[PDB]
Design a protein around this ligand. Structure first.
Ligand SMILES: Cc1cn([C@H]2C[C@H](O)[C@@H](COP(=O)(O)O)O2)c(=O)[nH]c1=O
Ligand SMILES: Cc1cn([C@H]2C[C@H](O)[C@@H](COP(=O)(O)O)O2)c(=O)[nH]c1=O
Ligand SMILES: [Fe+3]
Ligand SMILES: [Fe+3]
Ligand SMILES: [Fe+3]
Ligand SMILES: [Fe+3]
Lengths: 193, 193
């Protein structure tokens, strides 16, 4: 059960999350919980760890910049992090909020949440499940999600590569800064395409 | 004159280059020579250094993989370079071939040629002139070159940003590996957009 990992039941967690998140974001997290379960089952990842990480991945999405900065100092994280924003922080720094609020200590779950946006050059299968589940969950409707979903039914590694290439392409299209760890993921996985 | 920098006259250099390069590539280098002169004049960069660097930037474009690998060992360059290819090498490693062939020692010219493909987080105005001149020279006709040319008439920094964003976007679109120094350029310049 979820109580094996955090300090409350699934039902209690959903009540807490309904306070922290706008409706659309909670629905998203519920979608990721479901997609992560399906992917985990397909690719032989612990379905419970996948479901919980999937539900939690965007828990800290609505923390203020101030709170993230406090957490960076508190946990004496990479000071370069202060150069970034919510996009980078909600996973990379938000894991400390999750740990504080829910007493989550499992290193695999924490890591999967940590790099859910940016990935890493090296990702566990659990990491990959969350990263992909986020992108393909049933509530998303971006153009091309059908292709992501087809790829994810066949290959976890290729789904990671596809998502990362699309994100890097989109950020450059938008003229948005790209976190350097994202490029590590990109170059590590792009061959799978 | 060009003999102030290399071991032969412009006319002799063009004869040497006509041997090393296919016609279309030499015409390109001639275009870059001209565009670099115009940009240098506009932005107060030494027009002669700009013209020569512009003419030379793609000198080593047709060296074999073997030759580049030899040069990497010879000059004991970053061993990670062996993971890449001609795209990275012709500037980054090709500068050593240019130095060998032409006795070029000017650090500013060498550097401008060195990073003409990938840029750097920190670029001199000369570096920037070559990087942009390459993209906007009159022979190029890619969709959107008109926008690059308008930008380059107004702002060198914004032209660098525009080109870098477009290249990162294109490489990710293509599913091609992206050299990490390119991302340094991207993140350094993207604000100018
Ligand atoms: C990978 C990456 C994503 N993003 C953005 C794109 C998304 O709009 C936003 C939220 O990402 P997420 O939903 O995958 O957590 O973060 C960056 O700003 N920089 C990056 O390096
Ligand atoms: C910036 C960059 C360009 N390229 C490619 C795009 C171009 O087709 C090719 C030649 O670039 P150049 O004409 O700007 O020297 O190199 C990469 O492969 N990786 C990179 O990181
Ligand atoms: Fe997220
Ligand atoms: Fe999400
Ligand atoms: Fe080149
Ligand atoms: Fe060129």
């Amino acid at each position: 059960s979820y109580q094996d990992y955090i300090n409350c039941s699934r039902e209690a967690l959903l009540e807490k999350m309904a306070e922290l998140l706008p409706e659309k974001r909670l629905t998203h997290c519920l979608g990721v919980e479901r997609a992560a379960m399906e992917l985990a089952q397909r690719f032989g990842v612990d379905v419970e760890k996948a479901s919980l990480a999937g539900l939690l991945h965007d828990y800290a999405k609505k923390l203020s910049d101030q709170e993230f900065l406090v957490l960076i100092d508190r946990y004496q994280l990479d000071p370069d992090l202060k150069n970034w924003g919510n996009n980078v922080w909600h996973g990379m720094v938000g894991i400390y909020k999750i740990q504080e609020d829910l007493d989550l200590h499992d290193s695999e779950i924490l890591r999967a949440i940590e790099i859910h946006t940016v990935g890493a050059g090296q990702m566990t299968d659990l990491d990959k499940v969350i990263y992909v589940a986020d992108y393909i969950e049933h509530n998303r409707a971006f153009p091309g999600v059908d292709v992501a979903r087809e790829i994810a039914s066949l290959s976890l590694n290729k789904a990671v590569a596809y998502e990362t290439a699309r994100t890097v392409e989109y950020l450059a299209h938008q003229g948005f800064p790209i976190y350097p760890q994202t490029l590590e993921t990109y170059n590590a996985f792009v061959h799978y395409l």
